[PDB]
Amino acid sequence: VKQYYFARRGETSTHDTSLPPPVKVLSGRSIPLKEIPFEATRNELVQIYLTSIDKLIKSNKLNSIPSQQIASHYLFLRSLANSETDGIKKNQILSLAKPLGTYLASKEPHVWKMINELIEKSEYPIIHYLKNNRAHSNFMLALIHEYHKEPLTKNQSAFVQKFRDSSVFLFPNPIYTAWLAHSYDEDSSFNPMFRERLSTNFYHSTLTDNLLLRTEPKEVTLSSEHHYKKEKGPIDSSFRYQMSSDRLLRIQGRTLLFSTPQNDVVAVKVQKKGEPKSTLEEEFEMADYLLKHQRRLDVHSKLPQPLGQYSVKKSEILEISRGSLDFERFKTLIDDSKDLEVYVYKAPQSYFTYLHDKNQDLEDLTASVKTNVHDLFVLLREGIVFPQLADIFHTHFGEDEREDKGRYQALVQLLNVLQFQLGRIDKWQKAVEYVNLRSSGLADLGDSLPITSLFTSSDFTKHYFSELLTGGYHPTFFDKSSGTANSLFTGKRRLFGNYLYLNTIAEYLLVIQLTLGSYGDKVTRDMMDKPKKEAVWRELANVMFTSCAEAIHIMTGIPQSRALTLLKQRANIEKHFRQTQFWMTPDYSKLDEDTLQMEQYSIYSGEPEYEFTDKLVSGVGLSVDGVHQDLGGYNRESPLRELEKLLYATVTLIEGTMQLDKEFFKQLEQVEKILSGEIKTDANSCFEAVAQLLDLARPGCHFQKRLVLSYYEEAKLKYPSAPTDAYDSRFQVVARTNAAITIQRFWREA
Amino acid sequence: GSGFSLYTDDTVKAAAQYAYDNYLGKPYTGSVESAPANFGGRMVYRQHHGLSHTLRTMAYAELIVEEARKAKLRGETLGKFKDGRTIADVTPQELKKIMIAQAFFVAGRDDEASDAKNYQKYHEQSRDAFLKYVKDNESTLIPDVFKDQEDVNFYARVIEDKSHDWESTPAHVLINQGHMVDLVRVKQPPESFLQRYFSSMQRWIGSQATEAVFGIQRQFFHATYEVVAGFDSDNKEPHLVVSGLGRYVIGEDGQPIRYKLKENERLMRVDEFLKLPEIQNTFPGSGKHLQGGMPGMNEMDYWNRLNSLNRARCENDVDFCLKQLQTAHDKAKIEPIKQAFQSSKGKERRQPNVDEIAAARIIQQILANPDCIHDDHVLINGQKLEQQFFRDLLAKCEMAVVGSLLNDTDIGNIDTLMRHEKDTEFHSTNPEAVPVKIGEYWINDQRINNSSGNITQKKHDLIFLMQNDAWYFSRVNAIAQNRDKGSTFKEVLITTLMTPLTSKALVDTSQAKPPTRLFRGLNLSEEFTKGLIDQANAMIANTTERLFTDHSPEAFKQIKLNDLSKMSGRTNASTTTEIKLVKETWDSNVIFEMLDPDGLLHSKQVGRHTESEFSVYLPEDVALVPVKVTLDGKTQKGENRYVFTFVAVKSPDFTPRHESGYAVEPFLRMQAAKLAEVKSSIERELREQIQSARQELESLQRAVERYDALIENTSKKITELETG
Amino acid sequence: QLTEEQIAEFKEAFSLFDKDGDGTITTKELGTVMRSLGQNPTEAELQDMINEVDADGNGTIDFPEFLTMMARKMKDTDSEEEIREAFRVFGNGYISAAELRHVMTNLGEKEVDEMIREAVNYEEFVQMM
Ligand SMILES: Nc1ncnc2c1ncn2[C@@H]1O[C@H](COP(=O)(O)OP(=O)(O)OP(=O)(O)O)[C@@H](O)[C@H]1O
Ligand SMILES: Nc1ncnc2c1ncn2[C@@H]1O[C@H](COP(=O)(O)O)[C@@H](O)[C@H]1O
Ligand SMILES: [Ca+2]
Ligand SMILES: [Mg+2]
Ligand SMILES: [Mg+2]
């Protein structure tokens, strides 16, 4: 009855074990590829910034620069000094910051008052000071350029070239993680989009990149009782289903559906043209494993019951399935050999209706979608990945010689060098035509991989993600002084599994989105009342946001309502509604240019519109083949901008929450050691440590702050004869919130 | 130029949204012609002092500032304030403060009453609303946009308008004149109010800038679905004196006196008023007419347009109205440029010219017979062609059409020529860059990558070589643009041979349609950058929209006398649709942004190697006319980055005027020598008939044992190719 | 029977303190989880609890087991003195009602109509039940 997972998460030294050698082969030259270290380069740039601050102070012309910049510099210096642990460096940073504080107090009393108010709330006041569009201004880089009178090294130049939209990209790990976590707060108005009259810069993916480059390599250990670890005997049984065409319900793909007196369905899945018997055996075994561990894993879908796996004469199959109206086409799919292998199971009828079937109502669709999402993500936590839920392609033109092989990549910006946004989805509706998400729940369970196939070289990752595993090359990366091409991207060879994990999560969510869009498109096609169509599409958008919140909750454990609030901070549900309704229906194909542009104005409010120099085919819209609609013009980006923002927000929330928890426990260990006498330091240092631990708490989470308050009380008890006027407002606020929670709970109970 | 703009800045938009949500998007709390109106089924509560009016006033302020900057940059003298500052000296921060104040000017109104007491009450309420908004958001304004509370108080006092002070500071002038000029649409006598406002604004910026402002105001009205009133100099309505109401009257004799209900006198009319010497010598609108309404539609269509759901959207959605105004402003920026030049017939490259068919044939023979190349010259069956001949070919032939004249046999003969040459080429930039041999490189590349020898793979490899291998394209571009220093004759010959071939390969292998916006990166020194900025400012300052006067000749002269597109053409320039790529790979300190809404650039995509990269060979009939120059941050070295925005405009006025025969006379000499050789071998009238015509292509085409016959057949075919 | 918000808080804390993410928490992290959740077990009580409920030869606790543990512990520490301390945080014995609306609207879990109509001597309201 125990509920737990057969997979454990830990950390390794590097994912770079048996990868392709880091070499680019040109016409006849071999160019070695080299990594630019991230942490060392960032530290070098921070030290340069400190020297520039010293130069500024020596130049003693602070009255000539805006007070906002001085406040930014002072707050960052205070936060960096608090982060730094070495006594000498901390003292140097504080001495370097003192003159700015003196000048501000003397000449800007109100700015000084605001700065002090921020200081009393946090050990890293810079992160709260940058909870808005002020994060779009890179004061660190500006000062570095102003006062650094010598060229930056190649590594520093590359780092500056990559991370330049904000100065938060130069923060040390705890400060950057805290800022990223808090940027999703309700009081936060930050959104990663810098708009000017010239152009608009979306850099949401840069936050995820800067976060991922700071993480340790991850590893997943599968227990000896896992499906992919333990060995199982052959399929021992003598079952032989009796096929009678007088009760043949229908033919679905390469499967024969017969009826039963019990109202269930018997499905006979016949061997495919090129597939081996091992595929059917694996499907059988996976079905048994899931049916056995259903209670342990708490899977809500209706799993099929497998009955047997054996061989039948082809002539018999042809005889039984002769009367079906799809017999001719079903003939081609099956193997042409004399003898055919089969896999037989029993399932309810809803197991064969697809999740986008129009005959469902919105409530049933919502329930089925919730079931499918929950099952997918719990099985992901258990170490099983379904890379073939749907067959989604970015393009088919020259797919063989493409690095991606034409497979759509959810987080394209992260897995490639010099890719800036998601691309077109070819024949989007046909991608989820036979999706493995069914009304009952999951299906086609034999097409799964172990999660360890993402963190190591394997057929799947080598086939689809060779660019990530090999290293990035561009002529501008080539340094003639060494004969090597250096890039920050090559460093990802050490951590590619971390990227592929989030890519899989985003791919699941994208498949869900495409299925919902297909349902909405089919349902509203023959409707006439525009309000009814709008209501359908709005409900579908709500379902999508709820699915993303469920993914976050299952991955991190955040409450679903809070996860939805955090997502809504970053992604706009109204815009997603509008964009999905517009681009996923053929109506836009029957408009002239003026009306199309006028509608797009409302579709993308406060942002540039979607431009395409393509010809719309009447009745379909954007399509390269002319019969099947696409999502995006040829060689352009996908028009669903809010969907990309939502996917990136989801993956960023999950990864950043894990990283923030890691930082929080790292600081908690130091606090505990200090508070038990293991480390000898005065009262001020202990209170500083506890305040930092408080600043490393989850946004919107209270029990963490309760624990920190208890540790603060214990520390204050250990140092009764010490001043705490600095660390009193914040803990008083925490205590008041605790009391409010207690009162609310007691009242609502009665 | 700067990043800040009304249409993209977020704090101004937030201020406008707050004003609309709290004050402007609410029903009037009184009864003076204050009944909400219906437009397309949606309610507009304040149709005269609503959101559209405030957004239009803010747009007017920004437009006035930009026109003043242009006028100063034209060398005109502008009105001064109590200190030496003029309107053109207003900085982006001051403009932001002025616009945030302007967003609250009419917030405090409760009715449409126009009496003094109600005026003062409403302005007091507006001042209170502005102060409350600033106080509520002081956590992000008082340190950032406003210097301190004293500056906020200054702007609040401007909003209060206690004393009718409309000239003390730039803020007073901008706010008051924007608010006043927005009402030209409604005032029943249009000519008098237009003259008054033109005179009031002309003393601060000038006549040309005022005309531009009032010309763009009409476009703003059209974009916001507001009626546009016509201007009629020959109007018989009595003239109205805007200051107060005192009408002008003429004495009994007939002249003006320098209600009266005088017995034998009548009120002066508008037409008479506009004829006065003191007015017609300063008002450009005297004796001129403006057609009212939207041109190209009847009265019924116009009435339907003005009464539509779009009017309600403009009056109720801040972002929608801002986008409408932004689009109108961009169109008004582009329109005068096209107005100043003749109209292009089509959008296709012209047919081959006689001077270019000969060049194509010469290139064909050079490729087919690599042995014809010597140390530094080309001895082609009689004629010695030197470096300057090929330089003139590069500088005077449109190599796109020349490449269109070539066939796949040239792509094949590339291998023969490269095998013959095996010479060396040098980096144009960064001389200390380890030169390389070109023939060996091409042979090795073809041997390792294209063993089958198919033509399409050869075209792709040539395009790749042009797109990469700095050692090749740096020299080729430098030679093509005549910027090369110390170039060998072999390098010049290779450049002139490869350019049309690369164009032909790009045309053949390209499949995507031309994008409407492209970016190119250039690495330039500070002095050259300053020269370029001066040239671009000269372009921009003289381009204004017209109301009455026609200023097209000045803009045409300045653009023709200062064209900056010379440093873009003559080569297969590489561009990209994504500026992020430019800022991420090369980080150039200068960036050229080309807009091609019409598709005049014939941009060809470069195969994947790079999916966003295109190649442009600027047509001789197309000019790149700048529309703005912006300072956009700094490069990774810390140098200023400048972005020049150009608009591609095609007109015959930009067609270069070259002298023909630069490539044909050597050609006709070639066939003349060939005929003389064959006939000297022979030794009959054809020889003297063809020889007698010397270096006169038209005369030659008038004029024009088996091996000899083949020779004359070849010469004939050459001549009929030239004539065709 | 535990309230939905209590269940959500317990699930979040359990997931946070599950370091290896296998769905179970070891015995060295139970004390920290309890301190975070509000209940501060003594060393004797913690040792007894560990040796009682986590002596099955595995040493790990699954979430339903943790919920049973928490309900059992709360069954004997529901004294009203905790509510008295909560009210005392905000020595008159009469607490301003103007503060109650502020707190109940801008603190904790966000019904205030019944709060204002009930209307304040905190001890008297406690006895009101
Ligand atoms: N439900 C269906 N209805 C009709 N044709 C189908 C269906 N499912 C698959 N096909 C067709 O049959 C081909 C072979 O089926 P396929 O290998 O995809 O089955 P599957 O996904 O393993 O089965 P299932 O999802 O039922 O477990 C597909 O490529 C498609 O062309
Ligand atoms: N595999 C992929 N999945 C999704 N988008 C992609 C993929 N590859 C490229 N893109 C995007 O598609 C657009 C066209 O690039 P390309 O297809 O590589 O020519 C760009 O916006 C790319 O970032
Ligand atoms: Ca565990
Ligand atoms: Mg399937
Ligand atoms: Mg399958």
Residue A747's φ and ψ, nearest 5 degrees, are: -65, -50
Sheet of B383-385, strand order: B373-374, B377-380, B383-385
List of residues 6+ apart from B129 with CB closer than 8 A: B19, B22, B23, B104, B107, B108
Q: Facing residues of C121 across strands?
A: C94
Judge: A707–C32 Cβ closer than 8 Å, yes or no: yes
Question: Which chains lie within 8 Å of chain C at 3 or more CB pairs, if any?
Answer: A
CATH architecture of B354-654: Alpha-Beta Complex (3.90)
- Measured between CA atoms, the residue of chain B closest to residue A601 is B320
**Using H for helix, E for strand and C for coil, what is the string for B353-364?**
CHHHHHHHHHHH
Contact in structure between A747 and C115 (CB atoms under 8 Å): yes
Residue A85's φ and ψ, nearest 5 degrees, are: -100, -35
What letter represents residue B292's amino acid? G
In terms of Cβ atoms closer than 10 Å to its own Cβ (0-12, 13-18, 19+), residue A313 is exposed
Name the method of structure determination. cryo-EM
- Chain B CB within 8 Å of residue A300 CB: no
Q: What is the biggest distance separating any 2 CA atoms in chain A, rounded to whole angstroms? A: 97
What is the spatial distance between Cα B154 and Cα B115, in angstroms, rounded to a whole number? 26
Ligand 1 center to A437 CA (angstroms): 13
What is the spatial distance between Cα B492 and Cα B480, in angstroms, rounded to a whole number? 8
What is the spatial distance between Cα A706 and Cα B167, in angstroms, rounded to a whole number? 61
Residue B252's φ and ψ, nearest 5 degrees, are: -65, -40
Ligand 5 center to B552 CA (angstroms): 70
Decide yes or no: CATH 3.10.450 for domain B10-230+292-339.
no
List of residues 6+ apart from C12 with CB closer than 8 A: A557, A558, A559, A701, A703
- Check the CA dihedral B27-B28-B30-B32 and report its sign: negative
What is the spatial distance between Cα A212 and Cα A651, in angstroms, rounded to a whole number? 11
Q: What residue has token string 């190719």?
A: B721
Chains C and B touch (3+ CB pairs under 8 A): no
| Closest C-alpha among A562, A594, A600 to residue A581 | A600
What is the spatial distance between Cα A709 and Cα B33, in angstroms, rounded to a whole number? 62
CA distances from A20 to A17, A463, A469, B720 (A): 9, 12, 7, 60
Contact in structure between B382 and B667 (CB atoms under 8 Å): no
Contact in structure between A641 and A579 (CB atoms under 8 Å): yes
List of residues 6+ apart from B137 with CB closer than 8 A: B14
Contact in structure between B237 and B109 (CB atoms under 8 Å): no
The resolution of the experimental structure, rounded to one decimal in Å, is 2.5
- Mutate which of B611, B612, B613, B614 to test ligand 2's pocket (most atoms within 8 Å of Cβ)? B611
What is the spatial distance between Cα B53 and Cα B39, in angstroms, rounded to a whole number? 17
The structure tokens listed for B678 are: 């064959």
- Check the CA dihedral A683-A688-A691-A697 and report its sign: negative
Sheet of B590-595, strand order: B604-605, B613-616, B573-576, B517-522, B590-595, B640-650, B622-634
Q: Where are the beta strands (DSSP E) in B34-95?
A: 37-39, 42-44
Q: Which atom of ligand 2 is nearest to the CA of A422?
A: 5
The structure tokens listed for B464 are: 């790749």
Give the β-pairing of A30-35 and A484-487: parallel
Closest ligand to residue A254's CA = 1
- Check the CA dihedral B460-B461-B463-B467 and report its sign: positive
Q: What residue has token string 């004061």?
A: A139
How is chain B split into domains, by residue range?
A: 10-230+292-339, 231-290, 354-654, 664-723
What is the number of other CB atoms lying within 10 angstroms of the CB of residue A643?
25
Which of B441, B584, B638 faces A145 most closely, judged by CB atoms?
A: B638
What is the spatial distance between Cα A98 and Cα A77, in angstroms, rounded to a whole number? 10
| Closest C-alpha among A205, A568, A301 to residue A560 | A568
The structure tokens listed for B206 are: 């000038």
| Closest C-alpha among B316, B318, B338, B337 to residue B326 | B318
Find the length of chain B.
Answer: 724
Q: Facing residues of B614 across strands?
A: B575, B605
Q: Which residues of A touch C32 (CB under 8 A)?
A: 707
Using the CB atoms, write b or e for A119-157: b if 16+ within 10 Å. beebbbbbbbbbbbbbbbbbbbbbbbbebbeeebeebbb
Residue A79's φ and ψ, nearest 5 degrees, are: -65, -40
| Closest C-alpha among A446, A605, A357 to residue B10 | A605
The structure tokens listed for B534 are: 């001066």
Residue A605's φ and ψ, nearest 5 degrees, are: -85, 130
What is the spatial distance between Cα A81 and Cα B419, in angstroms, rounded to a whole number? 66
List of residues 6+ apart from B417 with CB closer than 8 A: B366, B367, B370, B497
Among the CATH numbers 3.90.1150.10, 1.10.238.10, 3.40.50.10540, 3.40.50.170, which is that of C4-75? Answer: 1.10.238.10
CA dihedral A528, A531, A532, A537 (to 10 degrees): 110
Contact in structure between B499 and B572 (CB atoms under 8 Å): yes
| Closest C-alpha among B244, B230, B234 to residue B273 | B234
What is the number of other CB atoms lying within 10 angstroms of the CB of residue A448?
22
| Closest C-alpha among B405, B392, B482 to residue B665 | B392
Rg for chain A (alpha carbons), in Å? 29
What letter represents residue B674's amino acid? K
**How is residue B238 annotated by DSSP?**
B
What is the spatial distance between Cα A20 and Cα A493, in angstroms, rounded to a whole number? 10
Residue A335's φ and ψ, nearest 5 degrees, are: -65, 150
What is the spatial distance between Cα A128 and Cα A135, in angstroms, rounded to a whole number? 10
Helix, strand or coil, per DSSP, at residue A639:
coil
What is the spatial distance between Cα A362 and Cα A371, in angstroms, rounded to a whole number? 14
Contact in structure between B602 and B654 (CB atoms under 8 Å): no
| Closest C-alpha among A647, A407, A384, A412 to residue A510 | A647
CA distances from B580 to A156, A306, A611, B467, B503 (A): 19, 54, 17, 18, 26
What is the spatial distance between Cα B39 and Cα A452, in angstroms, rounded to a whole number? 62
**How is residue B344 annotated by DSSP?**
P
Find the length of chain A.
Answer: 750
The structure tokens listed for B177 are: 């004149």
What is the number of other CB atoms lying within 10 angstroms of the CB of residue A87?
10
Contact in structure between A25 and C45 (CB atoms under 8 Å): no
- Chain C CB within 8 Å of residue A743 CB: yes
Using the CB atoms, write b or e for B662-679: b if 16+ within 10 Å. bbbbbbbbbbbebbeebb
DSSP string, A494-549: GTHHHHHHHHHHHHHHHHHHHHHHHHHHHHGGG---HHHHHHHHHHHHHHHHHHHH
A426 in a labelled binding site:
no
CA distances from B707 to A240, A361, B406, B711, B717 (A): 88, 87, 27, 6, 15
In terms of Cβ atoms closer than 10 Å to its own Cβ (0-12, 13-18, 19+), residue B689 is exposed
What is the distance, to the nearest Å, from the Cα of residue A386 to the centroid of all Cα atoms in its chain? 16
Q: Facing residues of A442 across strands?
A: A437
What is the spatial distance between Cα A418 and Cα A414, in angstroms, rounded to a whole number? 9
**How is residue A134 annotated by DSSP?**
G
Angle at A376 between CA A375 and CA A379, to 5 degrees: 80
Give the β-pairing of B289-290 and B231-232: antiparallel
The structure tokens listed for A664 are: 């929080």
In terms of Cβ atoms closer than 10 Å to its own Cβ (0-12, 13-18, 19+), residue B225 is buried
Which of A152, A195, A598 faces B10 most closely, judged by CB atoms?
A: A195
Indicate which of C9, C78, C107, C110 best probes the interface with A, i.e. most A CBs within 10 Å of its own CB: C107
Contact in structure between A356 and A327 (CB atoms under 8 Å): no
What is the spatial distance between Cα B199 and Cα C29, in angstroms, rounded to a whole number? 81
Q: Facing residues of B645 across strands?
A: B593, B628
What is the spatial distance between Cα A423 and Cα A750, in angstroms, rounded to a whole number? 55
Contact in structure between A124 and A178 (CB atoms under 8 Å): yes
Judge: A198–B3 Cβ closer than 8 Å, yes or no: yes
What is the spatial distance between Cα A611 and Cα A456, in angstroms, rounded to a whole number? 40
Judge: A738–C40 Cβ closer than 8 Å, yes or no: no
**Using H for helix, E for strand and C for coil, what is the string for A418-468?**
CCCCCECECCHHHHCCCCCEECCCECCCCCCEEHHHCCCCCHHHHHHCHHH
DSSP string, B408-450: HHHHHHHHHHHHHH--EE--SSSS-S--EEHHHHHHHHHHHH-
Residue B86 half-sphere exposure, CB side, CA atoms within 13 Å? Answer: 19
**How is residue C43 annotated by DSSP?**
H
Angle at B153 between CA B149 and CA B155, to 5 degrees: 120
- Measured between CA atoms, the residue of chain B closest to residue A154 is B636
| Closest C-alpha among A406, A500, A388, A498 to residue A449 | A388
| Closest C-alpha among A68, A53, A65 to residue A111 | A68
The response to whether residue A252 sits with its C-beta less than 6 Å from ligand 1 reads yes
What is the spatial distance between Cα A555 and Cα A557, in angstroms, rounded to a whole number? 6
Question: Which chains lie within 8 Å of chain B at 3 or more CB pairs, if any?
Answer: A
Contact in structure between A599 and A571 (CB atoms under 8 Å): no
List of residues 6+ apart from A251 with CB closer than 8 A: A257, A321, A324, A326, A327, A330
Q: Facing residues of A437 across strands?
A: A442
Q: Facing residues of A425 across strands?
A: A631
CA dihedral A468, A471, A476, A478 (to 10 degrees): 180
Contact in structure between A545 and A568 (CB atoms under 8 Å): yes
Residue B433's φ and ψ, nearest 5 degrees, are: -140, 30
What is the spatial distance between Cα B591 and Cα B599, in angstroms, rounded to a whole number? 21
The response to whether residue A335 sits with its C-beta less than 6 Å from ligand 1 reads no
Q: Facing residues of B650 across strands?
A: B622
Q: Which fold has domain A245-352?
A: Phosphorylase Kinase; domain 1 (3.30.200)
Using the CB atoms, write b or e for A528-549: b if 16+ within 10 Å. eeeeebeebbbbbbebbbbbbb
Q: What residue has token string 């003429």?
A: B250
Q: Is B10 left (phi over 0), alpha (psi -120 to 50) or beta?
A: alpha
